[PDB]
Write a protein that binds this ligand. Structure first.
Ligand SMILES: [Mn+2]
Ligand SMILES: [Mn+2]
Lengths: 295, 929, 295, 295, 93
DNA sequence: ATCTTCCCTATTTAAATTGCT
DNA sequence: AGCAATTTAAATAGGGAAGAT
C-alpha cells in the first residue's frame, strides 16, 4: 500500500443501496439482487454507505478500515424532525495523529474556548458560501443573501450563550432554505420523511456530508463524541457541525439543482463526487480544522 | 450527441457486430466503442445492429443513462457491466409460480384426454361430422372429475375410469375446480345464459358450479355414448412419470392456494389459461412427425394422421411450462432513452416538468392526465413513462388517424421505428399523393425493432408481420382493439398475444371518454389486467367524470392488490398522479381517493375559470331546429367573422339528420354566401380520406396558411355540417358552431372545435345550441339516445334544453368535471353523470368492471361486447360500380363548396338501412330517399 | 446503409499519417508498422486526409466513397504556399443534388452576380467570427477586432473588383493573424514551411478546414472549379474560398490556443473535431452556401 | 492487369489491377500479382485508374499528380469509377475549369444552344446505333430498324420543345426494345422491378453505361448537374443523357444476347468491358462530348 | 486528476492486475476502468501494477494524452487501441 | 494485390468443483 | 465465505491456403 492516498486526496465516494457488499478474488465489491457485482475502489474510497437491504461482511469491512474508509449505515432515523441516529464504524486500528485531539480537547474543556470556536465555526459556513459558489441556483453576493449573512454575523458576534447560537442557527437555516425555495420557485419544508425530491435529495446529501465529516474528523483523529455545539435539538455529535458547515454552500444548492433538473439519484451521487473532488471540499474541511486546532 | 457502446458478446457475434459498430463509432479498445453521432445515426446503428442476427449483446450509454440494451442483457441496475453472473441468486418461497406450474402441468397433461373417444377418432379419420356433440375439453373434464370422485385425484395411480355424460363437472375442492376449469376452457370459456346465475354468482367455485355442458360444449348430442367410450392407451413411461411429478408438485404447493384471495385466484387462473393455450397452440402449430399410432390428436394440412395423443399431451405440457417460465421470468426489451424528451418544456409545454415532481422509483403508477387539448398530452405521457427509466408501453388510442397523429409526433420529436410500432390492423389504402420524396409525413408499417424472447413460446414463432409488431414492441402505438382482447375472448387463442403484451408493458389510454360505456368497461378491465402485473396505467382525459376516474382507479387498485399479494408484498397503496396543464399531484392512495380527486378537480376548475371564457353558448328559443339553424347561422356570421369570412360547424347527430340540414341549407334563400360541406362517416374510402386531408389543412388556424386553401377574398360562409365524427379526434378550428344537442360531452367537444388554435376571446356568443334534437319530432319519448347517454332506463322528464341546460353558459370541461347525481331527470349533465356511475360501478355484476368469478366464464366477452355496434354490412364501390342496393344519385348543386369524387372504397351500412337503397351520392353519402 | 447519416450530421474526421489503409472484415482500418490496426467509422466519417507515408487500397476507397467520405492527400501541391493541387478525390458515384450547381453557375457566369456573391462570402467571415466565439482567446467584441471588422465591411461594401477584394483579404487575414500573435505574445510570421507550432498547427487546421469546406461543397454538388475569388495568390479554387470563412473564427484560434497551451498534434486534431461538431460547422457551411446560391 | 484505354487522341487512361503502386528509384512503378514490377511513362498518360485489388501510396500519388497524371479509383473493369478529382486546364500551373466545361455551361444556359444540343445528342445516338454494329443483334440496316431511325430523325428535327423530344426519345428507345423483343421471341416490357433475365441484365448493363458515361463526362471535366433531356431536379441526369447514346446501341444488344445465352453476370461484365475496349466506346463518348460542347 | 486505464492483457494477468486497478479506480466494464485519483495515487497504482508480475498490458490516459504504457504495448500512434493486430507490416530493403 | 472464407493451431479465457481456513 | 489450487472447456486470435474480383 506504500503511501496510502492521504485521506484528504482520497476521491471515490459511494452510498451502496440494495446490495450485499463482499470481497471477490482480492477486491471489495457489492452484489445486487440480480447477479451484478460492481467493484469498489477501496484504496481511493472516502466513505461507503449502506441503505435498506444492504449487508457488508467482515473481511470487506476490514479491507475498508485498514485502508482507511469510514463506513456508515444510512437508516436509523425514527423521529419526526431529526436525522436521528447514523451508525458509523471508525477505523481505529490505524493509530492516529495525537496532538490535534489534544488541541481539540483543550478547546472543548474550556467553556469560553468552546464558545470562541463555536463563533469561528459559525462564520465558517458564511465563508464557505463565499468561497464555494455554484454556477447555478442563487448568486451568493446578492442583496438578500448578504443581508441575512450580515445579520447572522452581527448576531453571532454579540452572542454569549450556546442557546443563542442554537436560535441563530435556526434563523440561519430557515433563511437559507427558504431563499433557495424562492429561487427554485417551490414551497419548501424540511421533513426527512417526505416524498418530495427536494427533501430526500437533502437527506441523501445529509448522508454524504456525514460521511465527508467523519472522514475529515478521522483523518485528524477527532471523535464525533466531542460536540462543540450542543442542545436539545442539536444532539448528533461533532458530525452535526462539520457536516452542516457545507449544507448551504455545497449540498443544499446541489440538492435543489438535482431536484429541479429531476433525473435519478445517481446523477446526484456523481454530482456530489464531482463537487467534493473538483473544489477539494474534504481537504478544505481538513485544512480548516487544521487552522482551528493550532490557533 | 455523444454515445458509448459496449459489447458483452461471445462467438464471432463479437465480430460481425463489430463491423457495423465500427462503421459508426471510433474504437477505444477492449471491445468498447465511443464517439459522437447523430440521432439518425443512432437509428441506422440500431437497425443494422439488430438485423445482423441473434445473440447481439450491445449496451449503449448516452452521457450516463443507458440509450439501449440489445438482448436480455442485465447490464445496469445501479452500476453497469457486471462480473460473472452464474446461477442461484434469490430462490424464495416463490409459491404462486410453483402454483401456476403445478396447475398448468396437471391440466396440460389432462387437457386432451377427451380426444380418445371413438367419435374424435372417426372425426380425424373423416367418416362423421367434424363438429363433436360434446367438445373434447369437456370429455377430458368429465374424465378428470370422474377420476376425482372415484379415487384421490392428487396422490394415486391414474387409470381412466368408465365415464358417463355429466352436465356439471365442478365440485367444491377449489384446486380441483381450478384444474377442471383449465381443462374445459383450454379452447373456449363456458357461457352462462341463466339470469339468476348472472345476477347472483360472485365467488370462484360458486360461479364455476353453474358452468354446465350446455354453455357451448353440448353442440347437438346424438352420439354421446360413443363420445364417452374411451381407450386407455396413454399409460406409458414418460407420460405417467410426467403426470406424477406435476401432480406431486401441485400437491406440495396447493397449501398456499387456499391463502389466496378471490382476485388472486381469478388472475392466476387467467395466467394459467393463457400459458395453457400458448403451449397448446405452440405444439399444435409445429409438425413433430413421429407417432406411436392407435390414437391421434391433430391433423396436418394434408389431413394425414399425426401427433399421437400421448406425445401431444407431453408436448403441450412442456410447451406450456416453457411458456409460463418465459412469461413469468422475462426482463422485457424497452425503448431507447429518447433525448428530446428529458429536457425542459418551454412555454405552453412548461407544465410537462411535472414529471420532476413524481418519484422515479415507484413500482406502480396510475396517471390521470386531465390536461386540455393542444398542450401535448401524449408527449407528456411519454415524458412520464421515461421519468421512471426506459419506456415500455402500449399507447392504445381510438381511431386509426389518431394513432397516426401520435406516431407522427413520436417520429418527429425523437422516436425511431427501432422502439416504436404503429399498429392499425386493417391495411387501409389511404396513400399520400403529390410528392413521395418531399412528404416528410405518412408514418408507415416497417418496425425494424427487436424481436422479443417471448416469440418462441407462441404458436409457429408468433406470426408474420402483425404479431411480431404486437408482442415485440417496446412502444406499441396501436388501435385499442389490439389490446382489449387481453381480458379474454369467446373462441380461439386471440387472448394470449395482447395478454402477454400487456403483462410486461405499461398501458397508456388517451381520451377514454370518446369510447362507449361497454368499451370503457372493457378498457378498465384492461387497466385492471395491466395493474395485475405491476405495470403503470396512464389515462389522459381532460373531460373526465369523477365516476370514470374513480372506477379506473378502483380497477388499478384491484390490479395492484393482485400484484402486491402475488409477490407476497404488503400493499401500501397506488401512486396516483393527478396531472393537468396547471400542475401535478402525486399521492400514495390506498383509500379516500374521492376527496383527493374532487379536490384536484376543483383546483383545476378554479385554474380554468379565472381564464377568459372562450366558448359562450346560447341555447336558442326557436323551436323548429331547421330555421333555428338558419337564424343561428345568420347571427353568428353577422357577429363572428374574419373580415366577412366565417367558418361554421353544424354538429348534428345522425346521417339523415346531416343530409336534412344540408338539403335545407342548400335550398335556403339568403343574401349570405353559404358554402356547404357534408362531414359524416358514411363515405367511400377515397371520398372520405379526401375530406379529412382538406379539412385538416383549411381549419388549421395556428397560421394563415389556410387563406390559400379557401377563397377568403370574397366574404363567404364556409359551413361544415357534421355528425359526431367531428367531435372526436379532429384538430379542427371553426369560428362558430351550431350544435344539435345529444350529450353534454358533445357540447364540450364541439366547444373544443371552436377557437381551438386561436386565443381571441369571443364577445357575444360563439355557440348556438339548438332547442331540441331532431329526434323529438320522430320520437318525443326518447330523443337523446343517439350519440348520447339518454336511454330507456334513464329518461329525461323534459326534453326542452331551457329546462335541462343553462340558457347562457360558458361551455368548458367544468360541468363534466364536477359530477352531479341529483336531478338527473331534468338536466343533461346530471343525466350523464348518473349513467356513468350506474354502469361503471364498483360491483362485479356480469357486464361490470370489477368482474370476478365471471372471468372464468365467457360472460364478460359476450354480454359486454367491445365496439358493440349494429349488424353493419358493407356495400362496396368497385371502380364506380356499386355492389348492392346502392343507386348513385345527384346532389343538390346549390352551395357545395368542395366535392371529391370516389371510385373505390366501401360504405358501412347498417342492416336496417340495407332494406332500402342507401342511395350513395358524391356529396353526402348515405340517406333515406 | 438505410438512410445514411446526412453528411452534415457526420461528426468524425481524420487525417491519417504513416499507415496502410485497407479493409479487414469489411472494416476501413489503417495499419501501422507496429502491427496495430485502428478502425475508422466510415459511415460517420466526414473526410480522411492522408499524410506522408500513407497508402490506401481500392476497397477502402470503394466503401469510403459509397459512404460519402472525401479522401485527400497532403502532398504534391500540398506545400500550401502555391496551394495549387491538394489531391482531393470526391465520391461522384453518388448522383448529387443539382440545383445548387444551377444557382451557383447562374451567379458565376454573371460577373456582377459573382462579385455580389463574393461580397456575401467575405461578409461570412465576420459572420463566422460573431457566431463562433471562443472563451480561451481573442474576444470578438473588443475595440481592435470590432474596428477591423467595421473597416473590412466598409471596404467590401465599396469594393469594385476582385483585385480590390484580393486586397481586403490581405488586410483581414494578415491583421487577424497579427492581432492574435500580439495577444499571444509571439512574433509571428505566417509561413506554411515554418517549423514552429504556431505554423504546423495552422497548416493542420488548414487541412481540416479544407476537408470541411470540400465536404460542404460536394454535399451540395458544388465543385471547386467555380471559385468566387480570382487572384494571383488565390490558386486552389472554391474549397479555399469556403475554408477561409472559418480560419480566423475557428482554425486560427484553435491553432493559436493549441500552440500556446502546448497541445500535441493529436489533441489539436481532436480540439478541431470538438469545435466542428459542438457548433455543427459542417451544417453551418452547408446551409450558408444554400443561402449563397439560393435563386 | 495493365490495361490501356484511348480517350481523346494521345493520352491514355491506364487501368491497373491487382497491383501495388509506389515509387521505386525515384519514379512511379507498381508491383503486380506475378511479383514483377512495371513502371509507367509519364508522357503518354494523363488518366491512370486503380481497379480492384489495387493500393497506391502517398508519394506515388503526389508524383503522379505533379507529372500531370491525374488518378481515379474505379471498380475492376475501368468503367465503374467512384472516386476522382476535377480536371483543370493544368494540374499545377493554375486552376481553371476546362474549356469543355465552360462551353457546356454556356451552351446549357442560352435556351437555343440547349435545344440544339439536345437535338444533336439524339443525332449522335442514331449515329452510335449504326457505328457500333453487333453480330448477334438486329441489323441496323434492316427496313424496320431504319424506319424507326428515320422516324426518330424526323421527330427530333421537327421538334421545338423538350417534352416532345422526351416522348420521341421514349418512342425510339422502347421501339428498339420492341424490335429486340421481336428478335428474341419474348414479351419484353421495360421495368426495373422485374426479376427476369432480360430486364435485370438490361438494368445492370445500363448501370455499366452510366459508369462509362460518368467516366467520359469526368474526363473532360463535365459536371453531373447539366442534363439536356432530363429535368433540372434529376440527380446526375447528364450521366443518363450521355449513357443514352450507347444504351440502345451497345448495352441493349449485349444484354439481350446475354439473356438469350443465359450466362452469368461477371462474364456479361467482361463482355461489356471487352466491347468498350475493342471499339473505344469511351473515346467515342469523349469525342461526342467534344463535338457537342465545341459546336 | 481524471484518468482512464485500459487493459490489453491475456491470461489471468487480466485478472490479478484487475484487483489492483479496481482498488484505485471504478470499473466501467469491458476491462476498462475510469475515475478520479491523486498523483500519489497514480504513483501507488504504478508501483503495485508493475511489481505484480510480467505481462501486464496497461494503458493509461490522462484527459486524452497517454499517461503511461506498461509493456511494449503499441497502444497509440494516432488513435488508441488497435484491433486486428498482426505481424508482417513493412518488410523493406 | 487485396480480401475473403475456412482449416488448422493452440493459445487463451471462464466456469466448475472443492478442501481450507 | 472467500479462496485457493486445479481441472475442464469454451472460445479468441493468428497463420496458411485457396478462391474470388
Ligand atoms: Mn384440445
Ligand atoms: Mn391440445
Amino acid at each position: 500500500m506504500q503511501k496510502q492516498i492521504l485521506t484528504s486526496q482520497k476521491r471515490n465516494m459511494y452510498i451502496l443501496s440494495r446490495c450485499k457488499v463482499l470481497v471477490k478474488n482480492g477486491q471489495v465489491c457489492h452484489l445486487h439482487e440480480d447477479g451484478n457485482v460492481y467493484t469498489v475502489p477501496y484504496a481511493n474510497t472516502v466513505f461507503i454507505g449502506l441503505a435498506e437491504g444492504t449487508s457488508i461482511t467482515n473481511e470487506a469491512m476490514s479491507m475498508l478500515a485498514a485502508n482507511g474508509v469510514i463506513v456508515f449505515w444510512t437508516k436509523g432515523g425514527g423521529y419526526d424532525m431529526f436525522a436521528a441516529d447514523i451508525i458509523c464504524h471508525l477505523p481505529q486500528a490505524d493509530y492516529r495523529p495525537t496532538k490535534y485531539m489534544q488541541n481539540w480537547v483543550r478547546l472543548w474543556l474550556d467553556e469560553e474556548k468552546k464558545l470562541s470556536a463555536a463563533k469561528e465555526i459559525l462564520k465558517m459556513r458564511v465563508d464557505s458560501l463565499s468561497t464555494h459558489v455554484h454556477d447555478f441556483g442563487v448568486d451568493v453576493e446578492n442583496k438578500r443573501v448578504s443581508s441575512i449573512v450580515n445579520k447572522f454575523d452581527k448576531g453571532v458576534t454579540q452572542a454569549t450563550s450556546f442557546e443563542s447560537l442554537l436560535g441563530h442557527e435556526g434563523t440561519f437555516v430557515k433563511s437559507l432554505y427558504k431563499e433557495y425555495a424562492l429561487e427554485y420557485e417551490i414551497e419548501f419544508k424540511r421533513d426527512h420523511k417526505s416524498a418530495d425530491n427536494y427533501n430526500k435529495f437533502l437527506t441523501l446529501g445529509n448522508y454524504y456530508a456525514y460521511g465527508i465529516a467523519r472522514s475529515s474528523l478521522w483523518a485528524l483523529g477527532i471523535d464525533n463524541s466531542f460536540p462543540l455545539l450542543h442542545g436539545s435539538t442539536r444532539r448528533g455529535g461533532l458530525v452535526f457541525d462539520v457536516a452542516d458547515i457545507i449544507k448551504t454552500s455545497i449540498i443544499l444548492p446541489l440538492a435543489f439543482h438535482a431536484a429541479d433538473q429531476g433525473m435519478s439519484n445517481t446523477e446526484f451521487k456523481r454530482s456530489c463526487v464531482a463537487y467534493f473532488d473538483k473544489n477539494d471540499i474534504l481537504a478544505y474541511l481538513i485544512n480548516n480544522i487544521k487552522r482551528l486546532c493550532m490557533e | 450527441m455523444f454515445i458509448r457502446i459496449k459489447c458483452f458478446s461471445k462467438q464471432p457475434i463479437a465480430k460481425k457486430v463489430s463491423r457495423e459498430v465500427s462503421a459508426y463509432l471510433e474504437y477505444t479498445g477492449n471491445n468498447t466503442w465511443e464517439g459522437h453521432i447523430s440521432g439518425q445515426g443512432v437509428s441506422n446503428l440500431q437497425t443494422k445492429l439488430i438485423n445482423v442476427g441473434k445473440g447481439v449483446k450491445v449496451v449503449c450509454n448516452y452521457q450516463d443513462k443507458v440509450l439501449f440494451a440489445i438482448g436480455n442483457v442485465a447490464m445496469s441496475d445501479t452500476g453497469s457491466v457486471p462480473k460473472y453472473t452464474t446461477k442461484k441468486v434469490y430462490k424464495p418461497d416463490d409459491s404462486i409460480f410453483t402454483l401456476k406450474q403445478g396447475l398448468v402441468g396437471v391440466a396440460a397433461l389432462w387437457h386432451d384426454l377427451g380426444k380418445a373417444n371413438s367419435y374424435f377418432q372417426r372425426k380425424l379419420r373423416g367418416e362423421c361430422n367434424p363438429s363433436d356433440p360434446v367438445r373434447h375439453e369437456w370429455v377430458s373434464g368429465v374424465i378428470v372429475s370422474t377420476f376425482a370422485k372415484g379415487n384421490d385425484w392428487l396422490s394415486d395411480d391414474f387409470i381412466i375410469p368408465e365415464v358417463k355424460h355429466s352436465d356439471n363437472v365442478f365440485g367444491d375442492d377449489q384446486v380441483l375446480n381450478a384444474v377442471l376449469w383449465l381443462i374445459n376452457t383450454h379452447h373456449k370459456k363456458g357461457l352462462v345464459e341463466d339470469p339468476i346465475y348472472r345476477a347472483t354468482k360472485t365467488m370462484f367455485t360458486e360461479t364455476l358450479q353453474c358452468v354446465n355442458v350446455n354453455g357451448g360444449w353440448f353442440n347437438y348430442g346424438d352420439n354421446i355414448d360413443e363420445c364417452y367410450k374411451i381407450d386407455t392407451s396413454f399409460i406409458t413411461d414418460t407420460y405417467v412419470k410426467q403426470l406424477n411429478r406435476y401432480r406431486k408438485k401441485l400437491l406440495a404447493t396447493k397449501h398456499i392456494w387456499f391463502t389466496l384471495g378471490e382476485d388472486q385466484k381469478i388472475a392466476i387462473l387467467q395466467e394459467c389459461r393463457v400459458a395453457l393455450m400458448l403451449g397448446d397452440s405452440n405444439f399444435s402449430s409445429d409438425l413433430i412427425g413421429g407417432d406411436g399410432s392407435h390414437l391421434y390428436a391433430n391433423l396436418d394440412e394434408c389431413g394425414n394422421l399425426k401427433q399421437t395423443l400421448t406425445q401431444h399431451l407431453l408436448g403441450v405440457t412442456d410447451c406450456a411450462l416453457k411458456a409460463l417460465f418465459t412469461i413469468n421470468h422475462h426482463k422485457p426489451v424497452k425503448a431507447n432513452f429518447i433525448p428530446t424528451i428529458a429536457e425542459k418544456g418551454e412555454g405552453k409545454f412548461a407544465w410537462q416538468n411535472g414529471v420532476n415532481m413524481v418519484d422515479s422509483s415507484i413500482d406502480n403508477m396510475f396517471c390521470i392526465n386531465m390536461a386540455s387539448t393542444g398542450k401535448g398530452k401524449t408527449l407528456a405521457n411519454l415524458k412520464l413513462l421515461q421519468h421512471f427509466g426506459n419506456v415500455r408501453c402500449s399507447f392504445g388510442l381510438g381511431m386509426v388517424s389518431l394513432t397516426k397523429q401520435t406516431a407522427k409526433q413520436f417520429l418527429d420529436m425523437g422516436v425511431d421505428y427501432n422502439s416504436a410500432a404503429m399498429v392499425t390492423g386493417f391495411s387501409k389504402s389511404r396513400f399520400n399523393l403529390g410528392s413521395e420524396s418531399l412528404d416528410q409525413d405518412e408514418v408507415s408499417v416497417e418496425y425494424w425493432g427487436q424481436t422479443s424472447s417471448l416469440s418462441k413460446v407462441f404458436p409457429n414463432n408468433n406470426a408474420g408481420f402483425k404479431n411480431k409488431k404486437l408482442l415485440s414492441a417496446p412502444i406499441l402505438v396501436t388501435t385499442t382493439d389490439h389490446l382489449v382482447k387481453a381480458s379474454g375472448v369467446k373462441k380461439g387463442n386471440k387472448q394470449m398475444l395482447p395478454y402477454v403484451r400487456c403483462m410486461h408493458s405499461d398501458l397508456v389510454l388517451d381520451e377514454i371518454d370518446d369510447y362507449g360505456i361497454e368499451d370503457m368497461v372493457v378498457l378498465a378491465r384492461l387497466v385492471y389486467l395491466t395493474a395485475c402485473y405491476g405495470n403503470k396505467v396512464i389515462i389522459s382525459s381532460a373531460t373526465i367524470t369523477p365516476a370514470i376516474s374513480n372506477i379506473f382507479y378502483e380497477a388499478y387498485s384491484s390490479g395492484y392488490k393482485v400484484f402486491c399479494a402475488n409477490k407476497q408484498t404488503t400493499y401500501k397503496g397506488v401512486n396516483v398522479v393527478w396531472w393537468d396543464e396547471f400542475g401535478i399531484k402525486v399521492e400514495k392512495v390506498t383509500d379516500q381517493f374521492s376527496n383527493l380527486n374532487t379536490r384536484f378537480v376543483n383546483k383545476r376548475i378554479t385554474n380554468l375559470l379565472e381564464s377568459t371564457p372562450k366558448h359562450k353558448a346560447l341555447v336558442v328559443d326557436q323551436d323548429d331546429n331547421m330555421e333555428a339553424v338558419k337564424q343561428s347561422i345568420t347571427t353568428l356570421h353577422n357577429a363572428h367573422n374574419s373580415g366577412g369570412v366565417s367558418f361554421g360547424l353544424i354538429r348534428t347527430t345522425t346521417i339523415k339528420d346531416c343530409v336534412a340540414v344540408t338539403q335545407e341549407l342548400q335550398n335556403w334563400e339568403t343574401d349570405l354566401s353559404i358554402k356547404i360541406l357534408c362531414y359524416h362517416s358514411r363515405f367511400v374510402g377515397d371520398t372520405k380520406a379526401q375530406m379529412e386531408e382538406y379539412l385538416s389543412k383549411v381549419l388549421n388556424r395556428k397560421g394563415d396558411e389556410y387563406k390559400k386553401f379557401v377563397d377568403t377574398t370574397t366574404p363567404t360562409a364556409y359551413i361544415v355540417v357534421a355528425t359526431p365524427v367531428v367531435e372526436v379526434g379532429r384538430d379542427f378550428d371553426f369560428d362558430w358552431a351550431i350544435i344539435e344537442p345529444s350529450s353534454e360531452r358533445s357540447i364540450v367537444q364541439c366547444a373544443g372545435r371552436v377557437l381551438r388554435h386561436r386565443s381571441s376571446t369571443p364577445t357575444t356568443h360563439n355557440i348556438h345550441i339548438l332547442k331540441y334534437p331532431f329526434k323529438f319530432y320522430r320520437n318525443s319519448n326518447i330523443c337523446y339516445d343517439v350519440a348520447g347517454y339518454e336511454s330507456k332506463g334513464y329518461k329525461l322528464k323534459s326534453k326542452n334544453m331551457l329546462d335541462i341546460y343553462k340558457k347562457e353558459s360558458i361551455v368548458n370541461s367544468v360541468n363534466r368535471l364536477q359530477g352531479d347525481a341529483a336531478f338527473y331527470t331534468k338536466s343533461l349533465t346530471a343525466l350523464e353523470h348518473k349513467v356513468l356511475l350506474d354502469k361503471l360501478t364498483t360491483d362485479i355484476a356480469d357486464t361490470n368492471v370489477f368482474v370476478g368469478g365471471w372471468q372464468l366464464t365467457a360472460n364478460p366477452h359476450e354480454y359486454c361486447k367491445w365496439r358493440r355496434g349494429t349488424k353493419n354490412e358493407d356495400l362496396v364501390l368497385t371502380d364506380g360500380k356499386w355492389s348492392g342496393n346502392v343507386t348513385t344519385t345527384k346532389p343538390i348543386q346549390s352551395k357545395i363548396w368542395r366535392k371529391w369524387q370516389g371510385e373505390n372504397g366501401s360504405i358501412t351500412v347498417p342492416e336496417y338501412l340495407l332494406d332500402k337503397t342507401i342511395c350513395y351520392n358524391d356529396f353526402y353519402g348515405g340517406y333515406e330517399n
